[PDB]
Amino acid sequence: HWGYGKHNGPEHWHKDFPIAKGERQSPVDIDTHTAKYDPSLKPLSVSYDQATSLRILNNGHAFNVEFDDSQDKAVLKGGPLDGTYRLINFHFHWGSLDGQGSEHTVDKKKYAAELHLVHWNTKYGDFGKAVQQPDGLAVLGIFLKVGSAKPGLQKVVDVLDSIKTKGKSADFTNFDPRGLLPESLDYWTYPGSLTTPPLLECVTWIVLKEPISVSSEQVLKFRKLNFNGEGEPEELMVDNWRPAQPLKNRQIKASFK
Ligand SMILES: [Hg+2]
Ligand SMILES: [Zn+2]
């Protein structure tokens, strides 16, 4: 179906998902000099102490670590959000080389990868209902730069060989997402969409200013995954990111001066 190749990549998506050319598509380039500092923005509140991871799977376009969202175990609130949002999964986007991989860019600067923590608004009951609302989802975006190793990411890196090809999954319990957070919670926020089909415009994006550092060895493991399923010719899972989209009639707000 859709993918990141020249015959089914981001440029072809609009044919099956017309919303690709919508009014609030993501990602976008964050112009730090145009971003409006908003003093009314409250600090973010991330309560991940009771998080419960269930499994990790390779879905053909990335690998998702899923969480139990049947209760307010791991929630995001505060910031530009009204209401409580539950963590359902987290995934990454990465490149074939250290100079690309992130979806959002800062003053045109691309990072090695980008982590997306996906949450849905509890007032809507379940994920499927939330994606029918303009304020249904909240995605926390975190940039990854190559430098020193991130200890809290090693548990994820080690299990990757078990889910090399499309369709494979493995139990992945007791993982604490707090180990993937930077020191500061300063952020930029804007209304956007999911960066992969169906590309629904229900997302309130919260992109953290401070990136986290991962080692070259850690990011190399990501590049060993496969897009294809077992038995099929090997297509390395790299460059699974969408190019920046037109900002249009939108304003990016910053929580910091
Ligand atoms: Hg929506
Ligand atoms: Zn994503």
UniProtKB/Swiss-Prot annotation:
<feature type="site" description="Fine-tunes the proton-transfer properties of H-64; involved in the binding of some activators, including histamine and L-histidine">
    <location>
        <position position="64"/>
    </location>
</feature>
<feature type="binding site">
    <location>
        <position position="91"/>
    </location>
    <ligand>
        <name>Zn(2+)</name>
    </ligand>
</feature>
<dbReference type="GO" id="GO:0043209">
    <property type="term" value="C:myelin sheath"/>
</dbReference>
<keyword id="KW-0597">Phosphoprotein</keyword>
<dbReference type="InterPro" id="IPR023561">
    <property type="entry name" value="Carbonic_anhydrase_a-class"/>
</dbReference>
<comment type="subunit">
    <text>Interacts with SLC4A4. Interaction with SLC4A7 regulates SLC4A7 transporter activity. Interacts with SLC26A6 isoform 4 (via C-terminus cytoplasmic domain).</text>
</comment>
<feature type="binding site">
    <location>
        <begin position="195"/>
        <end position="196"/>
    </location>
    <ligand>
        <name>substrate</name>
    </ligand>
</feature>
<feature type="modified residue" description="Phosphoserine">
    <location>
        <position position="169"/>
    </location>
</feature>
<dbReference type="GO" id="GO:0004089">
    <property type="term" value="F:carbonate dehydratase activity"/>
</dbReference>
<keyword id="KW-0963">Cytoplasm</keyword>
<dbReference type="GO" id="GO:0018820">
    <property type="term" value="F:cyanamide hydratase activity"/>
</dbReference>
<dbReference type="GO" id="GO:0070062">
    <property type="term" value="C:extracellular exosome"/>
</dbReference>
<dbReference type="GO" id="GO:0005886">
    <property type="term" value="C:plasma membrane"/>
</dbReference>
<feature type="active site" description="Proton donor/acceptor">
    <location>
        <position position="61"/>
    </location>
</feature>
<keyword id="KW-0862">Zinc</keyword>
<dbReference type="InterPro" id="IPR001148">
    <property type="entry name" value="CA_dom"/>
</dbReference>
<keyword id="KW-0479">Metal-binding</keyword>
<feature type="site" description="Fine-tunes the proton-transfer properties of H-64">
    <location>
        <position position="4"/>
    </location>
</feature>
<protein>
    <recommendedName>
        <fullName>Carbonic anhydrase 2</fullName>
        <ecNumber>4.2.1.1</ecNumber>
        <ecNumber>4.2.1.69</ecNumber>
    </recommendedName>
</protein>
<keyword id="KW-0456">Lyase</keyword>
<dbReference type="GO" id="GO:0046903">
    <property type="term" value="P:secretion"/>
</dbReference>
<feature type="site" description="Involved in the binding of some activators, including histamine and L-histidine">
    <location>
        <position position="89"/>
    </location>
</feature>
<comment type="similarity">
    <text>Belongs to the alpha-carbonic anhydrase family.</text>
</comment>
<dbReference type="Pfam" id="PF00194">
    <property type="entry name" value="Carb_anhydrase"/>
</dbReference>
<feature type="site" description="Fine-tunes the proton-transfer properties of H-64; involved in the binding of some activators, including histamine and L-histidine">
    <location>
        <position position="59"/>
    </location>
</feature>
<dbReference type="GO" id="GO:0051453">
    <property type="term" value="P:regulation of intracellular pH"/>
</dbReference>
<feature type="binding site">
    <location>
        <position position="93"/>
    </location>
    <ligand>
        <name>Zn(2+)</name>
    </ligand>
</feature>
<dbReference type="GO" id="GO:0038166">
    <property type="term" value="P:angiotensin-activated signaling pathway"/>
</dbReference>
<dbReference type="GO" id="GO:0044070">
    <property type="term" value="P:regulation of monoatomic anion transport"/>
</dbReference>
<feature type="modified residue" description="Phosphoserine">
    <location>
        <position position="162"/>
    </location>
</feature>
<dbReference type="GO" id="GO:0015670">
    <property type="term" value="P:carbon dioxide transport"/>
</dbReference>
<feature type="domain" description="Alpha-carbonic anhydrase">
    <location>
        <begin position="1"/>
        <end position="256"/>
    </location>
</feature>
<keyword id="KW-0007">Acetylation</keyword>
<keyword id="KW-0987">Osteopetrosis</keyword>
<dbReference type="GO" id="GO:0005737">
    <property type="term" value="C:cytoplasm"/>
</dbReference>
<dbReference type="GO" id="GO:0004064">
    <property type="term" value="F:arylesterase activity"/>
</dbReference>
<dbReference type="GO" id="GO:0008270">
    <property type="term" value="F:zinc ion binding"/>
</dbReference>
<keyword id="KW-0225">Disease variant</keyword>
<keyword id="KW-1003">Cell membrane</keyword>
<comment type="function">
    <text>Catalyzes the reversible hydration of carbon dioxide. Can also hydrate cyanamide to urea. Stimulates the chloride-bicarbonate exchange activity of SLC26A6. Essential for bone resorption and osteoclast differentiation. Involved in the regulation of fluid secretion into the anterior chamber of the eye. Contributes to intracellular pH regulation in the duodenal upper villous epithelium during proton-coupled peptide absorption.</text>
</comment>
<dbReference type="InterPro" id="IPR036398">
    <property type="entry name" value="CA_dom_sf"/>
</dbReference>
<dbReference type="GO" id="GO:2001225">
    <property type="term" value="P:regulation of chloride transport"/>
</dbReference>
